[PDB]
């Protein structure tokens, strides 16, 4: 076999307490990221706190774009492709600031009949995209601890 059950936690132990900072702390990305952090057992502190030795995740711009990816033989839209790009940065006490980002791709067939149903489907896809963006950002945290450690070796 060779396989083993993961011993080290997905969020690195230096980030088991961290600060979540956003221009929109009540909105969709902040809610997706906060739930993803809590499922990993992270303790989250407020943007202003008495601690000075706690890392922070600062959530930046989200861009969502839908474009026609495909057309029927009359040239009307068959499929939209939706891309969500999320930029964030991770700040470590007394150390350099590490950029991280997520890129989420989804698609759906249009229907000009049932336009109201397709908008509910698009809103539901966008809600799922914030969850995949939050996963992708959390899966990038081990690379920040690797770069942090290697910056001392350099």
């Amino acid at each position: 076999c060779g396989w083993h059950l993961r011993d080290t936690t997905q969020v690195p132990s230096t980030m088991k307490v961290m600060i979540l900072d956003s221009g929109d702390p009540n909105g969709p990305l902040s809610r997706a990221v906060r739930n993803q952090l809590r499922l990993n057992g992270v303790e989250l502190l407020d943007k202003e706190t008495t601690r000075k030795d706690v890392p922070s995740l600062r959530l930046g711009k989200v861009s969502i774009a839908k474009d026609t990816a495909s057309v029927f033989r009359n040239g009307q839209t068959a499929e939209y492709q939706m891309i969500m790009t999320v930029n964030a940065t991770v700040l470590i006490p007394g150390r350099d600031i590490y950029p991280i980002s997520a890129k989420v791709f989804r698609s759906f067939f249009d229907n000009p009949q049932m336009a109201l149903a397709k908008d509910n489907e698009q809103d539901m896809i966008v809600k799922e995209m914030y969850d995949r963006a939050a996963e992708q950002l959390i899966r990038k945290l081990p690379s920040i601890r690797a770069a942090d450690i290697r910056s001392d070796e350099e």
Binding site: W3, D7, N26, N40, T68, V71, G75, Q81, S143
Partner: protein
Amino acid sequence: ADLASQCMLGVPSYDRPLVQVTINADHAKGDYPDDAVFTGSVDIMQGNSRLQADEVQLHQKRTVDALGNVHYDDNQVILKGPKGWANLNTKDTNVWEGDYQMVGRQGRGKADLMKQRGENRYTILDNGSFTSCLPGSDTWSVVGSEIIHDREEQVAEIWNARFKVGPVPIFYSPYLQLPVGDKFLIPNAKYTTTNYFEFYLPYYWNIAPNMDATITPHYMHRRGNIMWENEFRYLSQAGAGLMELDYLPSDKVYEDEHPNDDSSRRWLFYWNHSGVMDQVWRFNVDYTKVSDPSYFNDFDNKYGSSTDGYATQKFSVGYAVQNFNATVSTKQFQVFSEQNTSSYSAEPQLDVNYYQNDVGPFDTRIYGQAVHFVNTRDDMPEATRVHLEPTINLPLSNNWGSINTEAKLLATHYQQTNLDWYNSRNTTKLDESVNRVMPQFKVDGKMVFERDMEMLAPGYTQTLEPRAQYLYVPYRDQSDIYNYDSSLLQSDYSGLFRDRTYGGLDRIASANQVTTGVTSRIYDDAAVERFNISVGQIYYFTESRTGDDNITWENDDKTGSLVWAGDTYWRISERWGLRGGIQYDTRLDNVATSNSSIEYRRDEDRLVQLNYRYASPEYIQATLPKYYSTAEQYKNGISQVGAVASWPIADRWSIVGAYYYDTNANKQADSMLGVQYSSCCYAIRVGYERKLNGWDNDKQHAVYDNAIGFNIELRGLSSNYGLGTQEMLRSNILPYQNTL
């Protein structure tokens, strides 16, 4: 060397002082106060600037006068002329018969009198000229009776304007305006086979702090009139937005090709708003409306495409906090096709969520919705729906796995009205009052395994992530509820784990299923994710049904492992990336949908992308209006190969192209070919675009539109030296997206 480095070789450099009075002369006479004079060659400095002359002749009663070779320069300008004056208290300055150059940016000319005014925010020129072209090059210039420029609002503004190409005037305007600085339209001209000669001549008006308009006459020579384009951009306590209002008073092409209409007017209104106030109030507008169905077939614009079947009209206002949100919205749709007038709208929709974590070991949430559904037709059903969704879950986790148990109650009340036309035409009746109450139960379980991948490269690691979910929802007949909001969703790999088959609340299918999948990831020695692949399937223990089971399929089988899906990404390098996705459905006996891309990007101007998209004929039957199965333009599915590419030549050309091909038709969907040549003071672009743009019902074949276009823009009005690639790459239907 890049175009910036070629143009900046003609732009004058500042470096003489250091940046953050002293005087030298051949001779000096008169006492220092009032009438001191310096005779023979003189240079004088103060901080950021120097003045130089054959004579300087002061007075105080504070004024400087200067005669012979008067030359002044600083960190923003050079001024030269035979005579000059300045007031040292007000900072006002004059130079007579002079020439000027900007410092650190392009811009030069002459005036009979050059002035600095208004705490030197304004420069003003009598009988002035302006060009962005480098010294010794005069390929265009603008000449005025008066020119003003404002350094704060970054605009030049000119009265009795003549535009010259070489020495020859080709335009006059009694007033004209040019952008001059960093702070998106610029004066522009086009020729095209679609509209013949065109121009775009934008004017920028500051209305108040951080709200500004761009009123833009757009001429189209094939047509009767100037289109007036009217972008308004703003910031506010409620957030930021853009409005547009395109208008043609009448349109000869629409009057010729759609005669006997009540009026010839063509217009578009677009309003976008988004933002948050006090971190708690959220405002959004996503609204487009047009005069007639054909507007986007006729007019190239940012705010829709000939590719579109409807214009969307959303408004919403919401309150959101950490533990609660409520949003009131309107969703409306202008459908362009005359084939069916039916279009439902939510007028209004109220959505509410409340969240309460740590209630014992449980986390709880409740979702509520109230919506009123209205139709464009007088004879379609109308409804009020109230939905309530109390939810409880128990998240258990450790280092290597998790299990999440969730229970919901799905409670919905319908009051449906205007039923007589439907119930007099259909065998299964709609009911006035319907109550639908359903329990839902979900168990989602995940694990993670790791392995050393030293077979591939030193220190790499492989992760294996198996997931299994059980879902239960008992059957309810819902054929007595009209489907106002519920589209059939698409099963991507992450979609294999939804608790919903339809995107709204008018159809909730029975569920009795296990969904199973695995993801594997490869990480390098930097712990960066280099590769992933995911594969999964849904096994159904009972037919997933709503009482409205009206779908064809190709097999009668409704149990077992019916749905399969998978996805992959490979980050081959920082420059190469490969993506792929597949769905298969045993009810269709076929691959349902698939897509792929491979991409190479060196930089913003050097890239190649190859992509493929597929949808099965049987998937079109199952998921789209029944007549798509019969119509030749829809029934064949999708089997589209695309290639998109950009590359620079000789640091000044960019060549861009795209080609999309239907493999079932053996015919092109779109092809595009852009060539832009960029210089320091102009860029010229050729843009070819051939697209599918309709269907000929009398002959059963595709209608193509060909645009052969040529365009010219001015340059060095701003810091822009980019070769135009990312704009060219999004000019067509099927526009480029970065797949790395």
